[PDB]
Amino acid sequence: GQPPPIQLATNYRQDIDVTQYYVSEKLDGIRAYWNGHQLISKQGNIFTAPTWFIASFPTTAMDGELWIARQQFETVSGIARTQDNQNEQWKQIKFMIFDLPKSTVSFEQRINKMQTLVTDTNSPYLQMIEQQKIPNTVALFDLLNKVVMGKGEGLMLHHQDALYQTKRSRDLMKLKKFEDAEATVIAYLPGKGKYEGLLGAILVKNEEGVTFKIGSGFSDEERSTPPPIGSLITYRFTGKTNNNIPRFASFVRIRVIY
Ligand SMILES: *P(=O)(O)OC[C@H]1O[C@@H](n2cnc3c(N)ncnc32)[C@H](O)[C@@H]1O
């Protein structure tokens, strides 16, 4: 089937006015688009949602996450992949909504409509993701910590004045504590001081063609036995610094030896 006409998120940017954004918990589920009569996956597959699961839903199109609870991704994914419209396991799933993709008004009014839709439907299977205002970035990062320590995935931000767009949107942003990506180890940088005779850092070249140093994230065993040159490794970072270098980059682990 054709992929559904959905809005996609960009990455958090430091220089926003956080007071203009609604903040919600980023849920680790399976995205579904409700077109008014069926649920559709990001790839265009029609989910075999049982009749009793969707029976109460309004015909307003809705965007949401099929989700059970924090840290139950494989469970919800396993159910949603099952081709069986009489599968009782859907009873533990909630369609957690976060937008109205056919709406032509601002996100603030869309939230108000969603609250009404959820309340009127009054079904265990349809619920609204909480949307809150946060006063400043320090408070936002404190909230991020609360959510992550509680085994949540992160936060999402959506500008109160945003109009729905069927593409990546700068008005919709993901905020996680960090990002991971891959790079190839190309050289060693011998250490000094406590790391004399050991690994000080590696030089890697990432998939965007940027070469940079990684000196943190190594165990003491890894400073004695470094990743092989040529290996594909995963590094962790958040945002970019000058010259498109991943910021606060640290070593995670080896993926492939070349
Ligand atoms: P991650 O990088 O896995 O991105 C999360 C995706 O799921 C959708 N999503 C989850 N939770 C929400 C909220 N609260 N609001 C909006 N969208 C959500 C996002 O589109 C991401 O694609």
Author numbering: 0 to 257
Show passages lifted from the paper.
The 1.65 Å resolution structure of the enzyme–adenylate complex presented here represents only the second structure of a bacterial ADL to date and is the only available structure of the minimal type of bacterial ADL.
The sealing of breaks in the phosphodiester backbone of double-stranded DNA is essential for the replication and survival of all organisms. This function is carried out by DNA ligases in a three-step reaction in which the enzyme first self-adenylates, followed by DNA binding and transfer of AMP to the 5′-phosphate terminus of the DNA nick, which is then activated for nucleophilic attack by the apposing 3′-OH group. Here, we report the biochemical and structural characterization of a bacterial ADL present in the partially sequenced genome of the psychrotolerant Psychromonas sp. strain SP041 isolated from Svalbard, Norway. This protein, hereafter referred to as Psy-Lig, is a minimal type of bacterial ADL possessing only the catalytic domains necessary for self-adenylation and nick-sealing and an N-terminal periplasmic localization sequence.
